[PDB]
Amino acid sequence: TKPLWTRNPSDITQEEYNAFYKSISNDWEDPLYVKHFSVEGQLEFRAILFIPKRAPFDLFESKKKKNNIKLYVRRVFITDEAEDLIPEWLSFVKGVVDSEDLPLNQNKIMKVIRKNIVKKLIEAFNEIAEDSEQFEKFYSAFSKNIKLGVHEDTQNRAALAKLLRYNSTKSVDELTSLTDYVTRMPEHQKNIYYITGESLKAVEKSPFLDALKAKNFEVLFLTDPIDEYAFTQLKEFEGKTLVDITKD
Template sequence: EKKKKTKKVERKEEKFERVNTQVAIWCRKPGTVSHEEYVEFYKHLTNDWQEHLAVKHFHVEGHVDFKGILFVPKQAPFDMFENKKKKISIKLMVRKVFITDECTDLLPEWLSFVKGVVDSDDLPLNISRETLQKSHVIENMKKVIVKKVVELISEMLEGKYKEGTEEDLKKKEEKKEEKDDEKDKKEEDDEELKSEEKWKTFYQQYSKNLKLGIHEDTDNREKLASFLRYYSTKSVDEFTSLDDYIDRMKEHQKSIYYISGESRKVCETSPFLEALKAKDFEVLFMDQAIDEYSISTLREYKEHKLVCISKDNLELEETEEEKKEREGDMARCGKLVSLIKDILGDKVEGVKLGYRLVSSPCVLTTSEFGWSAQMQRIMKSQALRDDSMTSFMMGKATLEINPRNKIIRALVRKLDDIHDSGEASTNEELRSAITLIYETALISSGFSVDNISDYSSKVFGMVALGICEDVDVEAPAPMVEEVPAEEAMGEKEEVEEGEADLEEVD
């Protein structure tokens, strides 16, 4: 049999080689990603030169199905609160396809420092901006993202933050069990220090964001308030939390006391602290401008009302002896109170005896729902402020005088002497003293004097009265050289003879 003729046919087969063999890092399980991979991805995503501070890797299933990685940078952006800045740094992906990085509905403004990637399977690929704004999926994703960031902050605070693969974490635990007790303790101490430094770094960089979150986020307000840290009269060198403050409260103390000011030093030296220090009550120092907004929104924490000690609503418990002293002071200082009110007129809302002072003669307090001195200073510095709103919220301050102060007692005695002598009206010396005391109380209470040149001239006049002899404060006498008594007598006789000669010439 003859063999069949065969023909060779060339056939091309195309084989596809996968170039991108690496799986998207946010699609991998959280326990399979190492610290080095997180660092590499973070630097690629953000173009940051240093490592991230913390990371949250999660996969959510339920009403919304999506994956994500959220990073907290070590350093806050210098333009974080500027209006022209891009408000969000999270990339929205749909099935690993990039959609947008300008979806402002994914995060609230107070979390604008968070960077990362979010990948959803529930959104369509051809989604538009209008659909994103009205999407219920985006709203649910936003709630979950905020919850995850709050969990991350809580882990850093409690020292429970861990990063790396499950194998690496297991190896660390096994090494701890194998090592000696002394080395064990050293390593544990080092880890505690690292976790404390991580939390301190976070709070130093993003404390303003937490306070802004208290002002804006009503759902997480109580949780965010537990993250706040302040200096206080009993914690001068280290931050203290509101929970620690409550643990140190006196048995009969019901409120959390605080004072706001330009700086911690201003708060520490404020005259409003005198009575509270005498009664051993702790006072928190709030020296950031945003504290005024956050505390006015918070109002209370764990059923304890937050009370500003520079306002009228401060109430301190009194003993029966103190109540009797108050009645005696009212009878003794009643005339002085009415006189001060007549002299100051519309400058103050009222004048009353105050018992929040120990050594200072007087202070100025604002109403409970009005602006404090610090808030008034903040609003005055606004370039585009509404003057009508400013004047309405500022109102007038109340002057509280301390009846136990020696200056106030001297004024009472002076006024009694004037009435006993039968003078029809008070002298100008008493009026100028009261005005000077009022203007000085303005400065010590955190307010500003309207006419600073007039006030400075009064202070210089008081200084001149104290250190200069035989000098008229209003019109200073010309400088005269001192002459010995014998030469002065000789000059006087020569002058008298000269005057006699002039009379003879006339």
């Protein structure tokens, strides 16, 4: 009879998290991942956040951001329609946030909660990334929210960019991360090369690939306008510069 989130992650089992998830998500499936944590220091609060196995329908209105994360303050419900609690590109997250001090009434306290949540969720994505198979599932569902985050989040960009995934000349069937791309780059390669296009088919046989394939340089394939734009906002990854081959 004690709020699940107030319990230590160690004492909670799956199915307990699953049932609790069903209880708040209007979803029948178990969550893809569960991020239960607590924050201490200047501000104190607990939270259980979930990443759905699949992107919800959300085809009722024009907008979308209707984050139904239940907001509690010392175990007493307050609202499931909080504002600025979590970024718009992350609205797909479901769960509960229980704060010790009143989120008040913009408010400052709310901002530090939002900051910790973003930090924890990136932490959850890198975790899902440990299983390239379960990560594909997550990418198929929220690759759009990730790209959106890389575009909206300048302070967490580099980190989020580590979540992008693309096909390449050396990554045909399976997708690859920009980190693995870097690792694969030969000693004399200084740039991360890529090419933009309407589709994979249209980009796979570009004559611009010849000057690279012959020098055994891997090249990424971007087919989404958001990925393209994102790359100009990223510029560099891990130190390497992003270069569009079609240009030069």
